[PDB]
């Protein structure tokens, strides 16, 4: 399809993994000091 | 594969090395004043 030329889904994946990294970092920041 | 046209992994590597640089800078900021 002509939409394949854009191929902007990698931006979505990058935002998703960045948010996941931030959330996991905050969790581990709480996990160590919780147990 | 058609996914090679995008080639967005360099963004992932850049984010990883930037985070590593920040973490190492903070560590050295603690390492000098710890020992």
Swiss-Prot record, chains A, B:
The chain crosses the membrane at residues 1-20. It comes from the Eukaryota. It is found in: Mitochondrion inner membrane. A motif (Mitochondrial-targeting signal) lies at residues 21-35. Coiled coil: none annotated. Present with 1990 molecules/cell in log phase SD medium. Belongs to the AAA ATPase family. BCS1 subfamily. Chaperone necessary for the incorporation of Rieske iron-sulfur protein RIP1 into the mitochondrial respiratory chain complex III. This is Mitochondrial chaperone BCS1. It comes from Saccharomyces cerevisiae (strain ATCC 204508 / S288c). The gene is BCS1. The chain holds residues 49 to 83 of 456 of the full protein.
């Amino acid at each position: 399809n002509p939409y394949f030329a854009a191929g902007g889904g990698l931006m979505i994946l990058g935002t998703g993994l960045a948010v996941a990294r931030s959330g996991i970092i905050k969790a581990s920041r709480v996990l160590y000091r919780q147990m």
